[PDB]
Design brief:
Blueprint lengths: L4 E5 L8 E5 L5 E2 L8 E3 L2 E8 L7 E3 L8 E3 L1 E2 L2 E2 L4 E2 L8 E4 L14 E4 L10 E10 L3 E6 L11 H7 L3 H11 L5 E3 H19 L24 H9 L18 E2 L3
Parallel strand pairs: 10-16, 12-14
Antiparallel strand pairs: 1-2, 2-3, 4-5, 5-11, 5-13, 6-7, 8-9, 11-12, 13-14, 13-15
PDB class: structural protein
Keywords: human inorganic pyrophosphatase, structural protein
Assembly: monomeric
């Protein structure tokens, strides 16, 4: 049902690896700017950057042309989040709501923790029902196609039907760099504000702070570029490669809290 797909260049977990998005006509688009914020009435789009229980720290490249998903790097080394006991990797499908900007502000699209049972793929586009927000801002949402989605309509339903998950969400974000929740309407207000900031970004009303705003579908954006011309950004990179690189065994360490 998603009218989107990915084009993966170079092997996963290499320095060259990039994940580009494509619309239903096979045109390369930016997941940051070209995917509409809404998938349908009361349903937001979510770009999945990291599947639940994975470790590779991948995210929309805010400064690169067409903003592909790529892995974070510090000091020439590819980055992976730690396993914080008792968790394995990211405890939720994690990603961003497109066409939002936390104007500096984290200088990126607003982040979403998506709590449903399906493990989504990197670069998968889904629809989510917003349930709340943790304060930078972490939206709490559920895949609208979850078999149980109708039971979740505000933040207290998470407490009711997924006990412990909110406390673990806070615990994870708290311990994360060591090597409270507002409700649906509040969350939607915050999201709509970040969408307005994004509008100012892509119409060049405000300084972009190095964000790459090139897009291929926004007719009212001066950054819109010709789709065929923009295909060269992807075609110039190494071709898709099926064999992923090995993850360093170091990544499997559990970190315990004293």
């Amino acid at each position: 049902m998603s009218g989107f797909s990915t084009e993966e260049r170079a092997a996963p977990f290499s320095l060259e690896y990039r994940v580009f998005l494509k619309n239903e006509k096979g045109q390369y688009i930016s997941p940051f700017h070209d995917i509409p914020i809404y998938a349908d009435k009361d349903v937001f789009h979510m770009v999945v950057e990291v599947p639940r229980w994975s470790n590779a720290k991948m995210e929309i490249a805010t400064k690169d042309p067409l903003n592909p998903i790529k892995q974070d790097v510090k000091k020439g080394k590819l980055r992976y989040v730690a396993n914080l006991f008792p968790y394995k990797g990211y405890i939720w499908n994690y990603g961003a709501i497109p066409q939002t900007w936390e104007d500096p502000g984290a200088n990126a699209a607003i982040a979403v923790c998506e709590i449903g049972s399906k493990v989504c793929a990197r670069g998968e586009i889904i629809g989510v029902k917003v349930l709340g927000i943790l304060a930078d801002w972490k939206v709490i949402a559920i895949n609208v196609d979850d078999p149980d989605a109708a039971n979740y309509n505000d933040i207290n339903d998470v407490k009711r039907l997924k006990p412990g998950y909110l406390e673990a969400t806070v615990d994870w974000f708290r311990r994360y760099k060591v090597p409270e929740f507002k409700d649906k309407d509040f969350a939607i207000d915050i999201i709509k504000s970040t969408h307005d900031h994004w509008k100012a970004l892509v119409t060049k009303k405000t300084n972009g702070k190095g964000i790459s705003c090139m897009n291929t579908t926004l007719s009212e954006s001066p950054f819109k570029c010709d789709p065929d011309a923009a295909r060269a950004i992807v075609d110039a990179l190494p071709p898709p490669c099926e064999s992923a690189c090995t993850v360093p065994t170091d990544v499997d360490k559990w970190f315990h809290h004293q």
